[PDB]
């Protein structure tokens, strides 16, 4: 009985698109990494895989879970928020929804 965890990823939250006062740009998203509070801490996560895991209705090829893959591109602001670019823009209904930030490609 291991009674332990299996988490190899850092938790994140999809806050919003890259936006101005009025105009929003779905191509780039903003992610809040848990425990990341400054730009120095965010620099560790640039270039890391980020996957949005959600559930669907129809089983396509053995699962109902679909994944959208992206990367952490650059830090946003001064509060540890990062910018992410995915294969497709996130559904925009996933504002405030969990994302997975993987530890690869690693350089440590």
């Amino acid at each position: 009985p291991s009674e332990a965890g299996h988490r190899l990823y850092v938790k994140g939250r999809h806050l919003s698109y890259q936006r101005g006062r009025r105009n929003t740009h779905p191509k780039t998203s903003l992610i809040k990494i848990e425990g990341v509070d400054d730009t120095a801490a965010a620099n560790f996560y640039l270039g890391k895989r980020v996957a949005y895991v959600y559930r669907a209705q129809k089983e396509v090829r053995g699962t109902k879970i679909r994944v959208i893959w992206g990367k952490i591109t650059r830090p946003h602001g001064n509060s540890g928020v990062v910018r992410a670019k995915f294969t497709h823009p996130l559904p925009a209904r996933s504002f405030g929804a969990s994302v997975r930030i993987m530890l690869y490609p690693s350089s440590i």
Binding site: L15, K32, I33, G35, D37, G80, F95
Partner: protein, 204 residues
């Protein structure tokens, strides 16, 4: 340090109403569920009659043709005063804004589900850390009682029952801590020599 939790139960005592609401609103839009307890113990800066003057001016604003529908529904409970502040801080006329409000819960006192949970505090909204020592402040419970809130005494009695049970729990709590220290002392002389400095060298 930006941790994510199932629900953060905030002890509303000693908090400035607006500053707590702004922080609560940002967390709700980010996707975090918030429960605020003891809204009657919240604080509003400035003198009391200024808070009373604002609410009476709020009572002025009423729809002329039909007060039943459309008009500003004035809520006298302390939690709904806090909820009004949070609602004005959230785009409640959107689907995203309504979903954010579903992550919020406000109460008078500490209902029995939450009287056994850990109440967090928001330092940025704490009155003792924010207000200049000479300035005046007022309590939301006092303003609510003066505008029509009917349940000030009932909430007060339930707090007395709640804190009496807390006294018994703390007496039990101190007994366990005393027993833990004694057990720790007895084991420390029997566990091992070699293990001891290994923990100490590692900081544990």
């Amino acid at each position: 340090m930006s941790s994510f939790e199932s629900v953060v139960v905030i002890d509303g005592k000693g908090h400035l109403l607006g500053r707590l609401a702004s922080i609560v609103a940002k967390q709700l839009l980010s996707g975090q569920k918030i429960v605020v307890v003891r809204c009657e113990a919240l604080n509003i800066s400035g003198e009391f009659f200024r808070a009373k003057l604002k609410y009476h001016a709020y009572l002025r604003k009423m729809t002329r043709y039909n007060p039943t529908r459309g008009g500003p529904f004035h809520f006298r409970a302390p939690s709904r005063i806090f909820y009004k502040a949070v609602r004005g801080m959230i785009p409640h006329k959107t689907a995203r804004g309504a979903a954010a409000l579903e992550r919020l819960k406000v109460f008078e006192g500490v209902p029995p589900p939450y009287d056994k949970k850990k109440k967090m505090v928001v330092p940025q909204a704490l009155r003792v850390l924010r207000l200049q020592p000479g300035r005046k402040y007022c309590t939301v419970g006092r303003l609510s009682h003066e505008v029509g809130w009917k349940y000030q005494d009932v909430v007060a009695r339930l707090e007395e029952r709640r804190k009496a049970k807390g006294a018994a729990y703390y007496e039990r709590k101190k007994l366990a801590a005393r027993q833990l220290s004694e057990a720790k002392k007895a084991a420390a002389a029997k566990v091992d020599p070699k293990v001891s400095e290994a923990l100490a060298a590692y900081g544990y």
